[PDB]
Amino acid sequence: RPQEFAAVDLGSNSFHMVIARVVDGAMQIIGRLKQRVHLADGLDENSVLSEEAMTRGLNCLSLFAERLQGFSPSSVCIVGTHTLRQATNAAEFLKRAEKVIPYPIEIISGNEEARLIFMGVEHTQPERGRKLVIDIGGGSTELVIGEDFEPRLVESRRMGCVSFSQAYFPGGVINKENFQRARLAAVQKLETLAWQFRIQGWTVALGASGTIKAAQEVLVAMGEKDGFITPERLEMLVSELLKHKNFDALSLPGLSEDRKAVFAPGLAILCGVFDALAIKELRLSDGALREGVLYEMEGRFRHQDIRSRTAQSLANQYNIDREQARRVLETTTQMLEQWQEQNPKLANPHLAALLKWAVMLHEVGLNINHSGMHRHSAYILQNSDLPGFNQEQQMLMATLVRYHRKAIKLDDLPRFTLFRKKQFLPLIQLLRLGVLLNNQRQATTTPPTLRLQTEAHHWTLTFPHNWFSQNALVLLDLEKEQQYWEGVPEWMLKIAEEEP
Amino acid sequence: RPQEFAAVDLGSNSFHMVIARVVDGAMQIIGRLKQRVHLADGLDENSVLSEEAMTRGLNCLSLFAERLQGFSPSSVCIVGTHTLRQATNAAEFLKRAEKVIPYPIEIISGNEEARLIFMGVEHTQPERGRKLVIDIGGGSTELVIGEDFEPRLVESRRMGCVSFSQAYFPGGVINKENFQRARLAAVQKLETLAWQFRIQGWTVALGASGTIKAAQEVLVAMGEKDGFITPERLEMLVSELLKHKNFDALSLPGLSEDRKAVFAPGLAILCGVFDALAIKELRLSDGALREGVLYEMEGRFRHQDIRSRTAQSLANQYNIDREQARRVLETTTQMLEQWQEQNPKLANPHLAALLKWAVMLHEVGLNINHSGMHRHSAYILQNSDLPGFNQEQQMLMATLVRYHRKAIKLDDLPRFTLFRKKQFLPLIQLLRLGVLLNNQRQATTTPPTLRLQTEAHHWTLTFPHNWFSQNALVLLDLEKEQQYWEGVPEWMLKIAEEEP
Ligand SMILES: [K+]
Ligand SMILES: [K+]
Ligand SMILES: [K+]
Ligand SMILES: [K+]
Ligand SMILES: [K+]
Ligand SMILES: [K+]
Ligand SMILES: [K+]
Ligand SMILES: [K+]
Ligand SMILES: [Mg+2]
DSSP: OOOEEEEEEEOSSOEEEEEEEEETTEEEEEEEEEEOOOOGGGBOTTSOBOHHHHHHHHHHHHHHHHHTTTOOGGGEEEEEOHHHHHOTTHHHHHHHHHTTOSSOEEEOOHHHHHHHHHHHHHHHOSOOSSEEEEEEOSSOEEEEEEETTEEEEEEEESOOTTHHHHHHSGGGBOOHHHHHHHHHHHHHHHHHHHHHHHHHOOSEEEEESHHHHHHHHHHHHTTOTTOOBOHHHHHHHHHHHTTOSBGGGOOOTTOOHHHHHHHHHHHHHHHHHHHHHTOSOEEEOSOOHHHIIIIIIISOOOOSOHHHHHHHHHHHHTTOOHHHHHHHHHHHHHHHHHHHHHOTTTOOHHHHHHHHHHHHHTTGGGGTOSTTHHHHHHHHHHHSOOTTOOHHHHHHHHHHHHTSSSOOOGGGOOOOSSOOHHHHHHHHHHHHHHHHTTTTGGGOOOOSOOEEEEETTEEEEEEOTTGGGGOHHHHHHHHHHHHHHHTSTTOEEEEEEOOO | OOEEEEEEEEOSSOEEEEEEEEETTEEEEEEEEEEOOOGGGGBOTTSOBOHHHHHHHHHHHHHHHHHTTTOOGGGEEEEEOHHHHHOTTHHHHHHHHTTTOSSOEEEOOHHHHHHHHHHHHHHHOSOOSOEEEEEEOSSOEEEEEEETTEEEEEEEESOOHHHHHHHHSGGGBOOHHHHHHHHHHHHHHHHHHHHHHHHHOOSEEEEESHHHHHHHHHHHHTTOTTOOBOHHHHHHHHHHHTTSSBTTTOOOTTOOHHHHTTHHHHHHHHHHHHHHHTOSOEEEOSOOHHHIIIIIIISOOOOSOHHHHHHHHHHHHTTOOHHHHHHHHHHHHHHHHHHHHHOTTTOOHHHHHHHHHHHHHTTGGGGTOSTTHHHHHHHHHHHSOOTTOOHHHHHHHHHHHHTSSSOOOGGGOOOOSSOOHHHHHHHHHHHHHHHHTTTTGGGOOOOSOOEEEEETTEEEEEEOTTGGGSOHHHHHHHHHHHHHHHTSTTOEEEEEEOOO
16 A cells, blocks of 8 residues: 555644545555634734634644544644744643644744745646745745755744734734835845845745735736736736725725735735845746655655656656657757757756756657546646656647647647747647657657758658668558648648758 | 567458557557558469559558568568459469568468457457457458357458459449348358357347448448447348449448448348348447457467456556545445335446446546546546447546536536436435545544435435544535536535434
């Protein structure tokens, strides 16, 4: 039986339990239970947790305990974060919980919390290199810069969307002076770290938790479909926010009812983080504290390049013929480099990387069926949980694979928020030809030279002199592909041989 | 690297190559090449194969050879059938074939051909009992009775759709006298076996190859949706055929152009087989000679109940938690037996078995994602190649799994030729409840008693007295399921506890 374990996050807004089993190097989620306990809402001005909040929390823990019956304590990790760190009657809550759930609650430090969030990012997110990770919680904010599974700068500050609500927006009143007071308070807590962080720098800035997730959802709902948080987009958010007089009137697109009461103080802190660190683009990370517990503390997953780790896992799960993947990769890369030289304005290194991963993974669907494999592979790639690829990157890979066989219908293409069609359409063409030219698998006869010439979507592939006199089946398959391209307006595939 | 091999069938109508690898007890096709060589059309009245037909065959073999470059001879099995048995210059074709493909062609006897067709049926088809297997080819017809991977009676007769075309439909003329002569000629060839076969008997009659496939496709196109071939439906086929004067003029719904010129002689043989053996119902098998070569001669797959063999393969490929399947099976079965005793008219043992297999396989999609698992499992079950399940049975299993979580939309139900909605809808209700009551996996608390009362689609589940005092999470999930049933017209789920 595969190893199973549970990560339990007793946070400021929700109590959240995840149960997973480890199979072939993949973290397979097998259960998830969450309730919006709103524990942070129960902290009064003296940091005493109300009876009402403790009662909601204990009721949630009793449900978790029912689901964890029989689990070894070695397979359960329950962490309490800033709300339980901050509550002066935290011992009372733990006393009650001991009678309800038979696993100890580990109240972790802000340093430990920041490290766990970073580790969840490192185990799951696409971007490699130095990264800035921001998490604005209910009563604490964590900021980390690190790389290669190693935090370098680790900071936590006592500010969050709930604790700033009453302090700076008493009675839930929204005006520019309340907002600016909250925003300047956040900058002041970041004063002593701001330049240290800017000087370390980062390849990407990533955010986690409700406040940042809410900001991303409001922007997307307001038409900014890519979801990146930028200073200009924050300015628009603040302007729409300040058109409301109270939390009760808040009617922003994409703002959930759960987030209405904390969106203004959260947005103030987010603006202060941007002012302090001069962030230009912040992207929401879907991996955070719970993934740090699962991947690092419990699963002990390998510290290696995440996309490669995920690809190795998929090769085991899906019996990937590695020699087939490799010969397709070599052919596709040889043509890609010629296409790139001839079309430097279309060349995109991030898209080129995804084309190569799509080559590695294009046969994952072969265990379902040879018939329609391109669809079955795309189904797996689109719907799986793949560390190292966000949803757009997954959708792009799945799209390249989906289109690598049979009739090409460009009207069925997904809409991408970032990727431009002019830049990934030639990648479909390259994948189709690279797979085709290796479709005899280990029987493939690899041409010693292969020249690609492009004029818009008219492509000429030239093979050695007299090549096809020995490779009639390749030519039949290429002639079929020519008919497929003939079916795409403006496309044309020409096949040629070198002169003697 | 997994075991890999090629099965090559040099038949009367087409030359067909299949290449497959064996992974986790699954036959995974990875290559297929076929050409309609029409080798039997080159046999003259003296059974001499024309050089023109030989050249069509040599061209095809040269393409197969290109795809087989480097294959070990032990990994390639090429079989020749009646056309090469009957040809007086078969040795000439074999000598020429040495120039274009470096693997020997084994010309097999009619009895070995019959046994391989039977073994292909045994390894792939859902019907488990003693079976009659009929294969009407271009110049030979095979008839086998056997069970449990063991032929009991094996026979081949020199009659086929191509050989009977010239002999009884000279010039391609269609009239009742030509047809009757061919039909009686078929009966005459069967006189020496008919009594012996009748005495052995059969649970089911299965047919394979083009003639029988064409008959089924014409019946379906004419409105006989289940595609089963009966004496009454054959009489309709003859009456329609005899309204046409020649092969060129012949036009029937569902008859392809490739089959138009051999449909009348093939149908006459089929009618003669139905007469000689008193067949009342014949179903088309999609497994035959090539599957016998692949599954028996090359793969050497286990002689066991095919559905169980397939399920054990899927359990390995898809990491099925067997204890979870077991507890869901026990719960679903306890409720199924109560529903059956209360609805004996709706009870159906075939559908009941498909429910139990759906239980065993409902988590095959969990490796793709916990999120949407019911859709992912259905995707795998619907699109895989599953020995022991025909297309309709596969779609029924996939449909049960697809509907076992989340909103219930009966208007998206697939239409089945055989299975009636009123009979499988309660199977959806049973699987949903059986999975739900075990959704805490090994932490499940199994009620000592569980009573199901059905009044049409108004179901009452009664749990032990005060049961939910310690199973609050089960009650929450049942209350959600009650909301799901509220969304289906005339459905209602009631939850109760026994009196003290
Ligand atoms: K339980
Ligand atoms: K936080
Ligand atoms: K602080
Ligand atoms: K930035
Ligand atoms: K080759
Ligand atoms: K070769
Ligand atoms: K019968
Ligand atoms: K239990
Ligand atoms: Mg991902």
